Design a protein around this nucleic acid. Sequence first.
RNA 1: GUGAAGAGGGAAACAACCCAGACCGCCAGCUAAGGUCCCAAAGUCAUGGUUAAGUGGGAAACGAUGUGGGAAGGCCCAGACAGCCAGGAUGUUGGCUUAGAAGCAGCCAUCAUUUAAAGAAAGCGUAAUAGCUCACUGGUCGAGUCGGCCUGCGCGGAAGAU
RNA 2: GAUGUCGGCUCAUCACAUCCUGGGGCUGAAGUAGGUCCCAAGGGUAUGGCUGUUCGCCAUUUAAAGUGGUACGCGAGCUGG
Lengths: 94, 164, 141, 70, 136, 176, 38
Amino acid sequence: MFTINAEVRKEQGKGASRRLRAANKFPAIIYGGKEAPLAIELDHDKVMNMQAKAEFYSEVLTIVVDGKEIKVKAQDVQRHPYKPKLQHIDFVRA
Amino acid sequence: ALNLQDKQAIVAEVSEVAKGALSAVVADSRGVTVDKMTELRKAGREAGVYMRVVRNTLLRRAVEGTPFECLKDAFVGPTLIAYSMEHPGAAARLFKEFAKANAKFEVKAAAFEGELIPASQIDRLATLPTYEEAIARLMATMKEASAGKLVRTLAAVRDAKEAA
Amino acid sequence: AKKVQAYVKLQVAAGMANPSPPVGPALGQQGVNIMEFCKAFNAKTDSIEKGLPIPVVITVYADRSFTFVTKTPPAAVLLKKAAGIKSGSGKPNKDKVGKISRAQLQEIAQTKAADMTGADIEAMTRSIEGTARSMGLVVED
Amino acid sequence: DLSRRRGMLKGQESEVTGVKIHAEVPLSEMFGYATQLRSLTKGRASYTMEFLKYDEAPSNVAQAVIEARG
Amino acid sequence: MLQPKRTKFRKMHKGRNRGLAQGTDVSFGSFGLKAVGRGRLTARQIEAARRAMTRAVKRQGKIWIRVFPDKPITEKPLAVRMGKGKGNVEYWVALIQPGKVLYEMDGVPEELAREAFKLAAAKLPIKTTFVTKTVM
Amino acid sequence: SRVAKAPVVVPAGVDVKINGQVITIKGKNGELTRTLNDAVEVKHADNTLTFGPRDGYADGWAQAGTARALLNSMVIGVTEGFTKKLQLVGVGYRAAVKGNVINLSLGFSHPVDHQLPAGITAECPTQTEIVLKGADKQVIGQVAADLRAYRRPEPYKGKGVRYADEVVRTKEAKKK
Amino acid sequence: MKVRASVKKLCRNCKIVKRDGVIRVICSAEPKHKQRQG
RNA sequence: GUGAAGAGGGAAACAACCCAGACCGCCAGCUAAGGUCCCAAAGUCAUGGUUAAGUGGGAAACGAUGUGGGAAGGCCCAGACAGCCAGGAUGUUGGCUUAGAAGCAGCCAUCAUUUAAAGAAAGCGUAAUAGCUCACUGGUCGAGUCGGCCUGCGCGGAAGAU
RNA sequence: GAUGUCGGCUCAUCACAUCCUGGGGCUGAAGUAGGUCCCAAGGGUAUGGCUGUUCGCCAUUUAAAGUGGUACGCGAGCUGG
């Protein structure tokens, strides 16, 4: 399973990133493989719900972004560090 | 939807038992206390007579939507299923025994084959000869009570008012 | 509360039974009348073999006469008596008492096979299986 | 009440028209005891006691006082 | 209670308890108490909460402490004219800021563990919140 | 679930005179039995209970549930009427019933009186049982309670004026 | 009875009402539990 | 940075705060901060959301079926929520412990039976089981409801001298 | 370049975290008494012994002999221990 969808980031660095984090988004990256690292957003409420399903962290994930679709296995995540939130997450390409 | 896992599983089993009852009785709870169920409950599952009391809100909607030896209407209220697959006596010997701590009319009615047996009939369903001759006495009886008794009885109480 | 009552429990001394006195002072305080003495004292009494303190069961109903009935001791009691065991475990199965033959259970099933609930002797034996394990006693081969 | 004094019960028996309770009791406590009992029961109950033997004290004051007195 | 074996200096500044935390997440045991608030915490207080929680919980699990109190903090004796050399070291302070985990414990079922940190939260200066394990 | 948004439709069981906002229930047993529920955002049609926009709140159709209770209590006052068993354990004292006036006691020397308001009346089968009988569940339970304020049950063993209290506490002497 | 700054339930079937202004416990078991004004 | 050595406006008053840096005269226009009912100059202005406290317009730990926002969620007419009626069992009254075993006295083991079904037991309650309530279980009822989490806003906690 | 510094006397005045007196909750409150507690500022609230003390200890009294503010009420009124 695990299926999320996303938009590609048009901004960068903290001033951007907070103005998103306020707006119920959070930023992320797909790095890995030959293809340059791709910086992306997810919606915080959506991908939060699968933080506690632990297959979010073990299993291959379907990442659809812009409508073009990658497939990804997760990497380490930053969480902010007293309210439930993923502050920003990294993902790795298969 | 639909609560518990027995409640969505049970529908084939309740439907199976609700075909099976070649005599059946719809009978009443409320004010039983433990004993009147218990004293049959132990011996029954050895002795070949069945008594269950089962969910009457599901049974009343379920029976409408599935014929369970005809029947449906008068299940309403708190309701037991007494049943014998056997020739009718085991089911009917049980009811006057249920009558000690309630009454004769906690059965609302009973069914045999497709004929409706109410308490008026019930004594007669409860009078049963030697088995090979009984099922013939029972077939001539239910065939009598189906159309002959109506056409006589609907006239007779109006004749009682005309003829005094 | 809830009105008149079914199956009231009392558990009572293994005295002379036709005469009253090891039963008499427990009778005395609860107002076991000369009449209560007649259903219990006159009767369900001697020509029954004392060895176990006898259950005595009260049905309540009354124009001033509520009644007290003598019968057989209960399954937990019979297990302790019948098996020729010491006295039960401190910690069931993590401490232990004895071993018991399933066939002794079966005879135990057979004597208690009056009103004991289980519509089958096999079902019946199993409840007292679960008693025997609770006391620590493995139903064993 | 018996429990209160630091008494500890041996056990309890019914009696012909009432009840009998038997117990081990501290001694230095009892000098309101009969009136207290009378108080509880509506004057009805009664008691007797004798000294069985000796067993530990934990109360401070007996040991504490012993240099003022002698 | 908790106190260090011999420090290089033995009085120390006011210090600056500014910023967040690097000593965050529940990491050791199954679940723990996160600090969630800002402030200063004594040795004696850590003691008062860890005792309270072990007695509440009743052992056969145990609690792991992720705070140590290092730091000297002074009393000036009463009625002293201001100045006159820095005060004397009185009690030891542990520095808390958001996210600092305080306690982790193991083995204890959630609802009973929910009560068991509820007591320590009544015992400290700060507004703690329960956290559970999780990988990655 | 049910009464907050479907207000029992309070049937016309003989019979309801509805001005508009002033309501008189016109039946036999405590005759012409009336209540003024005004326009507390409670609109009516024939014997129905209809909402409007309360103050700041605007609720959720809530006091139409209430208005339905207070009119039906009023209607049922004129049809069935009802038993206020008020009772005394208290070593009898006084309990003269006389028409509109009740003389009770609390060991106090003086005529305790109390004059029943018109709408209800009372009598005593024996001194220790008093039935107040009649009309409206609100005034009638008030006079009952104001009579039990001639004294509570005493809480240890129960001496007092007892209305609904078939549960009087049974404390005891010299601790348990 | 006490007047408190923390009000919460004693015997299980105790009850909680904000009457007049201030949230009172009330009870049908043992009425120790009448603890107002929290 | 200012005051000191800086006025004027504003924050009622108010050196150092915010605004602003006064050459002199005007019965001229714009504007800053700050404001726009009236004391007093200007919007009782349009728009939408919220708060029932006079919060606004003094303050905490903490406490709560106080109100709006929010996704996720269980339940959801094959009958819910819970009200009303009704069962709440069976071995059993569990073993051990025993001051005394009672589901509810400490502990252990949580086991079994007919079940449409009731824990070898959640709370009251008592003398030793008795006594009582309880989910659970069955009817009627005839629908939305319950539980969690995030969350804006208000509440008490809040008692001192003309 | 003037805040005449402690106690008492005369006169006070308010605050209420109320001493008592009035209402009321609870109570391991039977009556009695009481413990506690929410309420309440109206009025009342000691004499005498000793010492420069404020206080204090103490006799005896009352219903009670409150606590606190008011340059720790106060000298262009008094004493000056």
